[PDB]
């Protein structure tokens, strides 16, 4: 709706890729695409929204949260990107029901093309709190949503602890989390994990992770692949919420 | 005449940078000097914050296990060492928070395990690079107060780990440290039902920590963290509050 000026801030190799990635969504009569960003938080939702958009579109508090949700919309090459930032779902050791019901009621009649479930890469645990969140997502929008889901781990410019190589650490935390979201949602198929450094930078031109991958292209690429799998999208009716 | 005394202690110290051992040897005299012949340090916190790593750092030996994913270990380990007449005992403990809630199995064995021991210092442990503070933290403060009294906090030191941290958005290290501290002392005090000391010290347990020219581990703020810590321990050891004795009355 407002024009995607943010891409201009990206690297030319990233600009070229996003215009090509946006190109083959256009090629498939995919013109809009709505992404819902949900999680925990203070785990980098807003920041991720901001990195995608290419500018500071959502408030990031370094110290306490909130309950906004926002959709920001940016057109380019005839394609329109809607991202929804949303409050963290957890309060103390419980879901914040008010906050969930707001997300829901703000989504009333919108269409979730891709859900971006955000957590930190550099956490050392999973537990009922992670389970509850996957539970809340599934009860709100159905188990069908997880086929249009991607898990994004932020603080990806981590170097692990006691000499654990970067991949081992990564690989163990991906399963740790994938197992427990799969549990709370009750569930294969995919379901993709991408890495994210909102840092800002970051080490072509655009900005690689400590395993070689350029993540902004990689995330929009994963967003296109999850956007084109079928699958279908999820139309958030007044129906679905009472589930 | 001469005897063959037997004693525990402390090969760990020899592994510090020289400049650091010197300070530590000095502080231990400071303690002996005021007739403080042993210290028991109780180390408590949320899980996965570096309680064990810190105990390993202070003792300067892998004596307690490390857990990058996992927990695992649900019972206290005490490590005890000596030098020149002084005995250091340090109690590592399991994270008191699990899932949403306090873990009273964890908690209860901590309590049982401390009976008849005396707590000279409480090392409340947390991460520096956490952005949020909520009731889970406050539940932890409350659980400690409940278990030991508002008096334990006169022997509290709060110790934030992963100190080698470049704060986001260019916010300067000290400014971050200060807001994190302010926010956490607030919520400890709230759950603690208090209202300093409470000193806050930073910790970076990593091998790859930066070093000053004397090969001491340094914070980005320029301070040699280990001596600084041992020194805060000493000031609290020597402040004018009572150590905490663990009766049945205290823990019930
Ligand atoms: N180093 C680093 N810091 C990050 C990253 N993502 C977020 N942060 C930092 O973590 C803090 C929280 O980010 P934010 O986007 O507000 O997270 P949130 O999940 O939206 N918080 P809330 O849920 O309360 O709205 C900020 O200080 C931000 O800079 C990342 O990839 N790397
Ligand atoms: N970079 C860095 N990692 C640290 C630091 N302290 C601890 N860690 C890492 O954080 C993880 C947790 O350490 P650990 O000592 O088990 O924490 P804990 O508080 O004892 N956890 P638990 O409650 O399970 O016993 C380990 O991977 C360890 O390597 C620190 O100062 N810096
Ligand atoms: Mg946010
Ligand atoms: Mg431990």
From Swiss-Prot, chain B:
Residues 204-206 are annotated as: G5. Changing residue 127 to A: No dimerization and reduced GTPase activity. Homodimer and monomer. Part of the TOC core complex that includes a protein for the specific recognition of transit peptides surrounded by a ring composed of four proteins forming translocation channels, and four to five GTP-binding proteins providing energy. This core complex can interact with components of the TIC complex to form a larger import complex. Chloroplastic protein precursor such as prSS (precursor of the RuBisCO small subunit) interacts with these complexes. Signal peptide: none annotated. Residues 1-252 are cytoplasmic. GTP binds at residues 48-53, 72, 204-205. Keywords: Chloroplast, GTP-binding, Hydrolase, Membrane, Nucleotide-binding, Plastid, Plastid outer membrane, Protein transport, Transmembrane, Transmembrane helix, Transport. The keyword Hydrolase applies. Residues 92-95 are annotated as: G3. It is found in: Plastid, Chloroplast outer membrane. Residues 45-52 are annotated as: G1. Residues 71-75 are annotated as: G2. Belongs to the TRAFAC class TrmE-Era-EngA-EngB-Septin-like GTPase superfamily. AIG1/Toc34/Toc159-like paraseptin GTPase family. TOC34 subfamily. Residues 67-70, 127-132 are annotated as: Homodimerization. This is Translocase of chloroplast 34. Its main location: plastid. Residues 161-164 are annotated as: G4.
